From Swiss-Prot, chains A, B:
This is Protease. Residues 20-89 form the Peptidase A2 domain. Aspartyl protease that mediates proteolytic cleavages of Gag and Gag-Pol polyproteins during or shortly after the release of the virion from the plasma membrane. Cleavages take place as an ordered, step-wise cascade to yield mature proteins. This process is called maturation. Displays maximal activity during the budding process just prior to particle release from the cell. Also cleaves Nef and Vif, probably concomitantly with viral structural proteins on maturation of virus particles. Hydrolyzes host EIF4GI and PABP1 in order to shut off the capped cellular mRNA translation. The chain holds residues 501 to 599 of 1447 of the full protein. The active site is at D25 (for protease activity). The lineage of its organism: Viruses, Riboviria, Pararnavirae, Artverviricota, Revtraviricetes. Homodimer, whose active site consists of two apposed aspartic acid residues. Residues 1-5, 49-55, 88-99 are annotated as: Dimerization of protease. It comes from the Viruses.
């Protein structure tokens, strides 16, 4: 598909057995998902945005479907205002920015 | 060009006649540049990211070249951790996401 940028590039994702809407984000190194009760072990992390840092839980090898494309990788969970799909997963679904 | 996402999508911009590096950022509504002297009228604004909100100077109708493509639009100048080109200017240069 092709997604224009007139509006936020939101797509449906499936993670942890739940459907969510998430932003396809070339500016994000990492994938950050709003607080949800994912099972298993995690590692503490702090990540940096425009306004400072937030505390997140780092989960590895998380199964995650993005606009119908399967992916697996690291997902950070914590108190974000948007679910964001960053480059660690955008590469897995073969996304490019084109102009 | 077609830009893959294994690395940060950094390009050269020209703003105020000065060359800078900036991130092509589909997750950003707005374009935010580090503190600089910039010819133009500005008004105070607040914008949010992960981590919270910051104060910026909003400059409208600024000429900016992005990877050799012309845009003229709103640039926010302030203590951003990084120079980001958001959707307001990505749309001007005809950028899309593809997968
Ligand atoms: C997600 C994370 C891994 C932490 N990465 C980042 O946050 C990196 C950090 C980099 C260094 C600091 C400068 C910004 C760049 C790019 N960002 C990605 C970048 O795409 C980031 C992702 C994002 C989207 C929505 C909400 C929050 C955060 N967007 C932003 O920082 C832009 C800034 C702007 N235009 O005003 N924010 C928004 O466009 C935006 C939209 C909705 C919101 C609702 C509530 C609160 C804040 C909201 N911010």
């Amino acid at each position: 598909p092709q997604i224009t940028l007139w509006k936020r590039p939101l797509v449906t994702i499936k993670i942890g057995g739940q459907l969510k809407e998430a932003l396809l984000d070339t500016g994000a190194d990492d994938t950050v998902i709003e607080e949800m009760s994912l099972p298993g072990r995690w590692k503490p992390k702090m990540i940096g945005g425009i306004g400072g840092f937030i505390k997140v839980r780092q989960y590895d090898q998380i199964i995650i479907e993005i606009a119908g494309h399967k992916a697996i990788g690291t997902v950070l969970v914590g108190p974000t205002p948007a679910n964001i799909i960053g480059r660690n997963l955008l590469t897995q679904i073969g996304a490019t920015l084109n102009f």
